[PDB]
């Protein structure tokens, strides 16, 4: 049918590394206003992560070049660097606004399992965090607050509906800790959240699923890696 066709097209685009087309295919599935399968949520998440991740990488490269030129004072170059950075910031805003609109109009309203609700509020936290990463002043404070509110909603559902070993719950704890570290400049709160999620998983390692034990284990190493980076 149409839904299986769009999923197949998403998988072809993924193999071909044509992530715009992957996004467009999974947006059409999301627009059907149905509960996505695990596989469909994962394809949607990978598509947007690749499309935004190319611009986040470009932004950090351009920003690094800008610092270097600020240290040499090359003013001709800085006008061009700043205008190029601003063009990438425009694309980051458009991509984040696209998935955020899909989450608000289709995915969050059709979500009817604890897993799917945590997944979608977490993704909303992630995309407002990406809006906050490169933002200044008011725009940064507004993105940071929207991000924080979505991560709290995800955390509330995750704490009541998912075991502490669930990879969506661990992946939420990882990204939320990163939010506290990078966006709110709070290493203490970042460390507390990451250590608490790690310790709660250790306490109930009997809740590890055959389906996701290696995902859970990887995310628990990433929590430990942040703690290594932050302490």
């Amino acid at each position: 049918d149409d839904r299986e066709d769009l999923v197949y097209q998403a998988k072809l685009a993924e193999q071909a590394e044509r992530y715009d087309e992957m996004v467009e295919s999974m947006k059409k599935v999301a627009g059907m206003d149905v509960e996505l399968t695990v596989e469909e949520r994962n394809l949607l998440s990978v598509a947007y992560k690749n499309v935004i991740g190319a611009r986040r990488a470009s932004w950090r490269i351009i920003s690094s070049i800008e610092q270097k030129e600020e240290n040499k004072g090359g003013e001709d170059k800085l006008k061009m660097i700043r205008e190029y950075r601003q063009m990438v910031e425009t694309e980051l805003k458009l991509i984040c606004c696209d998935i955020l609109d899909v989450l608000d109009k289709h995915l969050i309203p059709a979500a009817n399992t604890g897993e799917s609700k945590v997944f979608y509020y977490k993704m909303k936290g992630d995309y407002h965090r990406y809006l906050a990463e490169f933002a200044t002043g008011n725009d940064r404070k507004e993105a940071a607050e929207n991000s924080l509110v979505a991560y709290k909603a995800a955390s509330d559902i995750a704490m009541t509906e998912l075991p502490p070993t669930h990879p969506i719950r661990l992946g939420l704890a990882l990204n939320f800790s990163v939010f506290y570290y990078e966006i709110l400049n709070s290493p203490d709160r970042a460390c507390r959240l990451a250590k608490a999620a790690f310790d709660d998983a250790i306490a109930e390692l009997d809740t590890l699923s055959e389906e996701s034990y290696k995902d859970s284990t990887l995310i628990m190493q990433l929590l430990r890696d942040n703690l290594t980076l932050w302490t």
Partner: peptide
Amino acid sequence: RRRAVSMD
């Protein structure tokens, strides 16, 4: 420069 890892 980044001193954090997120889900990827």
